[PDB]
């Protein structure tokens, strides 16, 4: 239909502008903070978030050309493996780093003494490695289950394959379904429920405390906080909701194909999540005036 054609074309340009803006912003943030700015805990967190976002966007054009030509992969097995490992690791690391930044801000606000006396750079990297190793652990099935699969028609898709794992098709299908459901539950809980609860709670207490202390001298802090939380919610809740609905209805989809709107709606939700990955430096790094003055002095 005419509406479906527009609804399919739009994610392409959304991912293209996401790629361009994310690469530009992440490169600028890395160049400013990582080289022309002092190494602080918040600077380390911003550097890690910018590095993850830059690695993701630099990988985005592969996904863009995949969505352009109907999810087909013209590239090789090793290249799709690497591209999806980088994509998954960057997404998990970006979400975990957003959660960790929210937690650090909450700790600094509610308990300033602990932040003053127990926030060192060495400890900063030591605790930031944790989200990264968590991303690797969650991606381990994506490392070792994923492999490119060619259909008998001669077209190639890099998806999940279970011929080696399962001797007979029945047990292979059963383990495929159970692993996909487990991955969906892990994504919804750790990837989405854990940070969204953390981000709302951490930013909620920060706004609650400053209101009681009479710290509200301008609308800028409240505006920034509400913008960040609202953007994160409106870009991540739909995508994770679609993923959860697909996982809980995966058996019906692969056995009867009852529902088809979820498959169509995956692409806009992925585009919105990628746009969030693009705008994270905008609402996390450029908000500070020190970064802006350093950037304008850099040019």
């Amino acid at each position: 239909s005419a509406g479906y054609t527009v609804l399919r074309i739009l994610p392409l340009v959304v991912l293209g502008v996401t790629f361009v803006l994310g690469v530009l912003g992440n490169g600028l943030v890395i160049w400013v903070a990582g080289f022309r700015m002092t190494r602080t805990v918040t600077t380390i967190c911003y550097l890690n978030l910018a590095l993850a976002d830059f690695s993701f966007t630099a990988t985005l054009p592969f996904l863009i050309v995949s969505m352009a030509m109907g999810e087909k992969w013209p590239f090789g097995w090793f290249l799709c493996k690497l591209i999806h490992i980088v994509v998954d690791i960057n997404l998990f690391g970006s979400v975990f780093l957003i959660g960790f930044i929210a937690l650090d801000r909450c700790i600094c606000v509610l308990h300033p003494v602990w932040a003053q006396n127990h926030r060192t750079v060495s400890l900063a990297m030591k605790v930031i490695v944790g989200p990264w190793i968590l991303a690797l652990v969650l991606t381990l099935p994506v490392f070792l289950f994923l492999t490119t699969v060619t259909i008998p028609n001669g077209d190639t898709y890099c998806t999940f394959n279970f011929a080696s794992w399962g001797g007979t098709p029945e047990e292979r299908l059963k383990v495929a379904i159970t692993m996909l459901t487990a991955r969906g539950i892990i994504r919804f809980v750790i990837g989405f429920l854990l940070p969204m609860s953390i981000v709302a709670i951490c930013y909620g207490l920060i706004a609650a405390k400053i209101h009681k202390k009479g710290m509200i001298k301008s609308s800028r802090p409240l505006r920034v906080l509400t913008a960040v939380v609202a953007s994160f919610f409106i870009c991540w809740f739909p995508f994770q909701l679609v993923a959860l609905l697909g996982t809980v209805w995966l058996k019906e989809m692969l056995f009867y194909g009852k529902y088809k709107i979820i498959d169509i709606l995956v692409n806009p939700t992925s585009s919105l999540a990628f746009f969030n990955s693009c705008l994270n430096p905008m609402l996390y790094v450029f908000v500070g005036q020190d970064f802006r003055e350093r950037l304008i002095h850099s040019l």
Partner: peptide
Amino acid sequence: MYFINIL
């Protein structure tokens, strides 16, 4: 995180 289609 990134949704992967199933054949």
